Motif scaffolding. Sequence first.
Motif, short mmCIF file in Angstrom:
data_model
loop_
_atom_site.label_atom_id
_atom_site.label_comp_id
_atom_site.label_asym_id
_atom_site.label_seq_id
_atom_site.Cartn_x
_atom_site.Cartn_y
_atom_site.Cartn_z
N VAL A 28 -10.61 -8.52 5.10
CA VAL A 28 -9.57 -9.31 5.80
C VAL A 28 -8.44 -9.66 4.81
CG1 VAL A 28 -9.15 -11.49 7.00
CG2 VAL A 28 -11.25 -10.20 7.46
N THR A 29 -8.78 -10.05 3.58
CA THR A 29 -7.80 -10.48 2.55
C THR A 29 -6.90 -9.29 2.21
OG1 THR A 29 -9.57 -11.90 1.69
CG2 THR A 29 -7.53 -11.84 0.44
N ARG A 30 -7.50 -8.12 2.05
CA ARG A 30 -6.83 -6.82 1.76
C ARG A 30 -5.76 -6.57 2.83
NH1 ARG A 30 -7.08 -1.82 3.76
NH2 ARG A 30 -6.86 -0.09 2.29
N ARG A 31 -6.17 -6.65 4.09
CA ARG A 31 -5.30 -6.45 5.28
C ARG A 31 -4.12 -7.44 5.18
NH1 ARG A 31 -4.63 -3.05 6.90
NH2 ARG A 31 -2.39 -3.42 6.62
N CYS A 32 -4.41 -8.72 4.94
CA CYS A 32 -3.38 -9.79 4.84
C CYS A 32 -2.41 -9.49 3.70
CB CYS A 32 -4.03 -11.15 4.67
SG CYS A 32 -4.90 -11.68 6.17
N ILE A 33 -2.93 -9.09 2.54
CA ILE A 33 -2.08 -8.78 1.36
C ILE A 33 -1.17 -7.59 1.68
CG2 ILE A 33 -2.11 -7.87 -0.98
CD1 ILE A 33 -4.66 -9.81 -1.36
N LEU A 34 -1.71 -6.52 2.27
CA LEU A 34 -0.87 -5.35 2.65
C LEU A 34 0.21 -5.82 3.63
CD1 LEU A 34 -3.67 -2.65 2.95
CD2 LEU A 34 -1.77 -2.68 1.32
N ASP A 35 -0.14 -6.66 4.59
CA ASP A 35 0.83 -7.11 5.61
C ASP A 35 1.94 -7.93 4.93
OD1 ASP A 35 -0.69 -5.87 7.55
OD2 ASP A 35 -1.44 -7.71 8.49
N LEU A 36 1.59 -8.85 4.03
CA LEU A 36 2.59 -9.68 3.30
C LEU A 36 3.51 -8.76 2.50
CD1 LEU A 36 0.43 -12.71 2.13
CD2 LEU A 36 2.21 -12.63 3.91
N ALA A 37 2.92 -7.79 1.79
CA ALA A 37 3.67 -6.91 0.86
C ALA A 37 4.67 -6.06 1.65
CB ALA A 37 2.71 -6.06 0.07
N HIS A 38 4.26 -5.52 2.80
CA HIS A 38 5.15 -4.75 3.72
C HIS A 38 6.27 -5.68 4.20
CE1 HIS A 38 3.12 -0.93 3.88
NE2 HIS A 38 1.96 -1.48 4.25
N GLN A 39 5.91 -6.91 4.57
CA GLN A 39 6.89 -7.89 5.11
C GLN A 39 7.96 -8.18 4.04
OE1 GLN A 39 5.29 -11.56 6.85
NE2 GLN A 39 6.80 -12.63 5.59
N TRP A 40 7.56 -8.44 2.79
CA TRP A 40 8.51 -8.75 1.69
C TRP A 40 9.44 -7.56 1.40
CZ3 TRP A 40 3.95 -11.02 -1.55
CH2 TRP A 40 3.60 -12.25 -1.02
N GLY A 41 8.90 -6.34 1.41
CA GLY A 41 9.69 -5.11 1.22
C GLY A 41 10.34 -5.06 -0.16
N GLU A 42 9.74 -5.66 -1.19
CA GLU A 42 10.39 -5.76 -2.53
C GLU A 42 9.93 -4.62 -3.45
OE1 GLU A 42 9.99 -9.74 -4.02
OE2 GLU A 42 10.77 -10.58 -2.11
N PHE A 43 8.89 -3.89 -3.05
CA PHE A 43 8.31 -2.77 -3.80
C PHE A 43 7.57 -1.86 -2.82
CE2 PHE A 43 6.06 -6.81 -4.48
CZ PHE A 43 4.90 -6.58 -3.77
N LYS A 44 7.20 -0.67 -3.29
CA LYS A 44 6.39 0.30 -2.52
C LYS A 44 4.97 -0.25 -2.34
CE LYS A 44 5.39 5.23 -2.14
NZ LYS A 44 5.40 6.54 -2.83
N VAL A 45 4.41 -0.04 -1.16
CA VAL A 45 3.04 -0.46 -0.78
C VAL A 45 2.27 0.80 -0.39
CG1 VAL A 45 1.69 -1.90 0.79
CG2 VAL A 45 3.95 -2.66 -0.01
N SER A 46 1.21 1.14 -1.12
CA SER A 46 0.53 2.45 -1.02
C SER A 46 -0.98 2.25 -0.90
CB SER A 46 0.88 3.30 -2.21
OG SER A 46 2.26 3.58 -2.23
N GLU A 47 -1.57 2.78 0.17
CA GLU A 47 -3.03 2.97 0.29
C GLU A 47 -3.30 4.37 -0.25
OE1 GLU A 47 -4.82 1.13 3.86
OE2 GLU A 47 -2.73 0.92 4.52
N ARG A 48 -3.82 4.46 -1.48
CA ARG A 48 -3.86 5.73 -2.24
C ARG A 48 -5.00 5.68 -3.26
NH1 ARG A 48 0.27 6.65 -7.08
NH2 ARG A 48 -1.71 7.47 -7.87
N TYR A 49 -5.47 6.86 -3.67
CA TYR A 49 -6.51 6.99 -4.71
C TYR A 49 -5.91 6.60 -6.06
CZ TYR A 49 -9.15 9.24 -0.98
OH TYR A 49 -9.81 9.49 0.17
N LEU A 50 -6.71 5.89 -6.84
CA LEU A 50 -6.41 5.48 -8.23
C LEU A 50 -7.62 5.87 -9.09
CD1 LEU A 50 -5.11 1.91 -7.33
CD2 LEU A 50 -3.71 3.87 -7.96
N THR A 51 -7.39 6.53 -10.22
CA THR A 51 -8.46 6.95 -11.15
C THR A 51 -8.37 6.15 -12.44
OG1 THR A 51 -7.19 8.65 -12.17
CG2 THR A 51 -8.44 9.29 -10.17
N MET A 52 -9.46 6.11 -13.21
CA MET A 52 -9.46 5.54 -14.58
C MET A 52 -8.36 6.22 -15.42
SD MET A 52 -11.35 2.98 -14.89
CE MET A 52 -11.09 2.85 -16.65
N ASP A 53 -8.17 7.53 -15.28
CA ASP A 53 -7.14 8.28 -16.04
C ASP A 53 -5.73 7.80 -15.64
OD1 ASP A 53 -6.59 10.89 -17.79
OD2 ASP A 53 -5.19 10.95 -16.07
#
Lengths: 362, 362
Positions: B265-290
């Motif tokens: 639920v917190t994840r969903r809320c954070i993505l929604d806030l971040a999209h709303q602010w529109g101050e940076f790119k918001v990406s649901e994407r793979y992240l590796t240790m590298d």
Amino acid sequence: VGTFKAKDLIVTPATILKEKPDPNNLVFGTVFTDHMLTVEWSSEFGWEKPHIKPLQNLSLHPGSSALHYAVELFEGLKAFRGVDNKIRLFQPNLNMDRMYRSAVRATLPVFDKEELLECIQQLVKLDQEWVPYSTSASLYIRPTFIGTEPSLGVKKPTKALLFVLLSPVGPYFSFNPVSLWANPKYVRAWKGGTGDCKMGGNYGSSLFAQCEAVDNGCQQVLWLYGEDHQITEVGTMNLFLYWINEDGEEELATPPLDGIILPGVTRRCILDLAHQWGEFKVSERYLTMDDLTTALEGNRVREMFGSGTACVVCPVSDILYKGETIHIPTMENGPKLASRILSKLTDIQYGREERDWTIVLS
Amino acid sequence: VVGTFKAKDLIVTPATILKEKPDPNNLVFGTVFTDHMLTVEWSSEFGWEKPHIKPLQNLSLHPGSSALHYAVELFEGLKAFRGVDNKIRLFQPNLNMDRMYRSAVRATLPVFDKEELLECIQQLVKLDQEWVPYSTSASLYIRPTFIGTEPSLGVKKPTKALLFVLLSPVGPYFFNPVSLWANPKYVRAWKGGTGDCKMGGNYGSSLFAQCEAVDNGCQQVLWLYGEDHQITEVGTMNLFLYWINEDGEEELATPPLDGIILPGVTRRCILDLAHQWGEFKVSERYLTMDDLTTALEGNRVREMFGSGTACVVCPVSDILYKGETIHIPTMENGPKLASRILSKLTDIQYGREERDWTIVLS
Ligand SMILES: Cc1ccccc1Oc1cc(-n2c(=O)cc(C(F)(F)c3ccccc3)[nH]c2=O)c(F)cc1C#N
Ligand SMILES: Cc1ccccc1Oc1cc(-n2c(=O)cc(C(F)(F)c3ccccc3)[nH]c2=O)c(F)cc1C#N
Ligand SMILES: *Cc1c(COP(=O)(O)O)cnc(C)c1O
Ligand SMILES: *Cc1c(COP(=O)(O)O)cnc(C)c1O
Ligand SMILES: [Mg+2]
């Protein structure tokens, strides 16, 4: 780090005893004997004395980690009333080894394997009249180990309960071969998971696929792994394939212990018998659906069966895979190896022959 | 059969002796419980019994209960918040009911009416409302729990179950940033598994790594997946990375919902806030240790934090990986985004602003 001791056993006999069931009308795991074993643990005081007392409900704090985070493991072994009326356990030390290993992986406290086995023997001895008067029935023994910490924290449990239930059970077949449901959408176990331990968490996640199996007229799930659809387990049982391999050699093959296979006692016994006989190749090796369907096309498959305490050997007649029914000719090939294995293990279990693999009851 | 319980059928057995409430500053997460609990019994034969609000008590479970053997169990986590206006609010509680229903279907536990359960939860919080802390940094943790109670050892859909709810006052934490233990030997969840559901079995199998984390001075496991060591979850929390990405763009990134991520639920809320602010790119994407170590070498990482009901935002300062400590400069970068998110979500939770995301206690 310590252990409970069998010499400290406190025995509270039931004053009202239940009627034993008809040995021919037994449904697996539904009838319980008069008594149970319970042992309490705390991080503060360690292991309490073990208790043999009347079968009762458990009184658990609703915060118990077993109920929230599946901090739990179990075993399955059997007592057998022999043709000589002596009650035997079968390779019970292998169950104790696996239970200890499962406890370490679950972060539950370690215990002395010999003390637990002696407590189990004393429990079976007190309830020994529950060991069925039948050469096709047995007493199922269910050692269970649960986290009972009254807190929602994700952490090593500081409170636990080790208990043992007894259940008279009939023959698996009341050879009625099984149809397997092969759906690669569901994965039983992953590398870096707990699939090689008898931890409760491995089974909760498997129930949906089992209900989907039953909905399609199948008794067990064929657990497939990876991009090449490795055949891993026949539901709750280890998987054996008796076939002519790719080199034209007669072979008994089973998946290797690489982290996603429960190391079965029955599996171990079957591999040991097969090596002992020295009549064909014995291979712990990867088997794929493609290996199997290629072999079936070449008439190279003889028998496929599951192995486990519950069945001994469970012949496979069919696999449902990508919307077709694939026939396995097990029952048209005797099944000669399956029958030989069943006959050998049953002869040992019921004392028709002497073996290093059985212990006469305490 | 009764297909669902109804809140209008609630039977209320009040406690006659009430416990002293804890100091809101001296709270250890999930160790203190309120006066009352909700319990609802189910059987296949009669369906749902009437729901009960009664004194906190131990559960009386048959020792054969499938919750204890095969992890037939799931849970939820949500909070009640005493507002600056002294009104008690829930936060997106319908998302918890939806997730619990979905988890029940996957567990093969019986379905329930989501609105009736929420109304039962509201009536329980209302009865124990004085447990909702008088503090802008404390809350009442709500733990709906759903267990199989079938008194039989067979592997199958449970024919008996218990749905219960516990209440536990909790403090602001359990910003003191966390150290993460990254060991690829252990895998939290796999494609074809249940990692996208809050089923107990997902946590029992994860405990060993958490105890190994704590043994190395870490508070959470960084859960790695696949041959490229995808970073998936910050222990019990969803993973966020605030960085300059590979294209030189300011980005907030979180792993996608591909089956191995719990949809927070917190994840969903954070993505929604971040999209709303529109101050940076918001990406649901793979992240590796590298990706991460390359970014850290290039001074491209700003902040890393976990998200979850229990913490809101949990900044990450360090990762232990292949025998090295990797510093994450979160706390040297404010942490500006983490602070802004915490400030916004707490302003909504404690009624400092109006929101579609809160419901005033009924
Ligand atoms: C002492 C300390 C210092 C700093 C940071 C954390 C600390 O305590 C911990 C708390 C938790 N911890 C929980 O105990 C329970 C939940 C939950 F109940 F909220 C949940 C459960 C299961 C799934 C989701 C949430 N969350 C969660 O993070 C943990 F896993 C590990 C540690 C450690 N170390
Ligand atoms: C009895 C039977 C005969 C013939 C055809 C169907 C039968 O019914 C089933 C029984 C079982 N079944 C269990 O219920 C429990 C165990 C265990 F308790 F021994 C164990 C638990 C967990 C892990 C290992 C073993 N084994 C096991 O096979 C099953 F999984 C599926 C079906 C179906 N359909
Ligand atoms: C218990 C179990 C087996 C069989 O073990 P035995 O010791 O032979 O009864 C096989 N596969 C799985 C997944 C199991 O849990
Ligand atoms: C519960 C949970 C989350 C996030 O849940 P919230 O709904 O934000 O509290 C993340 N990861 C895991 C593994 C979880 O169990
Ligand atoms: Mg309705």
